[PDB]
Amino acid sequence: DDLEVKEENGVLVLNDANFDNFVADKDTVLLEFYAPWCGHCKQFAPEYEKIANILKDKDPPIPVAKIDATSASVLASRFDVSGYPTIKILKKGQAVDYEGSRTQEEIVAKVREVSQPDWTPPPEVTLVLTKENFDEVVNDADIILVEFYAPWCGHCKKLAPEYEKAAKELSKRSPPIPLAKVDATAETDLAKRFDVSGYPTLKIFRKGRPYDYNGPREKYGIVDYMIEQSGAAAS
């Protein structure tokens, strides 16, 4: 957890202590999460070094970094890293999953694609609420689940992906069931209104009235709770 960002063969070394300092002003960063004891990480290491050197030499350069997930537990938690090597591209501070091959040609091409100023992530099914539209959305929905989250909160990240997955399955229903989220650190006035004092905080709204959500936080369970609570008890 040293403050210094060292470079090892062209590749920056990031850890729980220096990660935010380093990435906060970078539009695009390539990340590798590895474990010291992983043979496949060791085999990939020279290829990742070649990638770092290719991306350093384009105009403008794109930083390439590695993280030891076994000692950077906070980061591995934030990025929901379970297996190695895991590659991610950080674009304006948000993680994009890389599921392709561990080759220079594919990784460099994808990095260059996401680095483009007009590149956008796939749109998400989950509704974004702010003080401007919160009431209009919530009051018109027969039932709606709302997650109040803080971007700074590490323990939350493990199941943030499950929430989007649940939202996608629930939107394909007749009638569709909406899931929404509220960034409580940005939306301080909504957070106070609903007495948000900790995270995650999930609330079900039924005809505009809030109820604490005490269901499960895994995809299948969120989907089932919501289906059953909407009036399909046998489903």
* E-only strand ranges, the chain: 6-8, 11-14, 28-34, 64-68, 86-91, 94-97, 127-128, 143-149, 179-183, 201-206, 209-212
Q: If binding is defined by CB under 5 A, does position 169 make contact with Zn ion?
A: no
Candidate residues 140, 142, 189, 195; the one interacting with Zn ion per rule CB under 5 A:
140
Positions in 109-138 near Zn ion (CB under 5 A): none
Least distance in Å: CB of 10 to Zn ion? 53
Q: Which two tokens stand for residue 16?
A: 């729980």
Active site residue 38: yes
Contact with Zn ion (CB under 5 A): which of 16, 49, 183, 224?
224
Catalytic member of 41, 65, 141, 184? 41
Is residue 119 within 8 Å of 183, Cβ to Cβ? no
- Tell me, by CB under 5 A, how many residues bind Zn ion: 3
In the complex, the smallest distance separating the C-beta of residue 139 from Zn ion, rounded to whole angstroms, is 8
Residue 88: active-site member: no
Active site residues: 38, 41, 153, 156
Per CB under 5 A, residues contacting Zn ion are 140, 224, 228
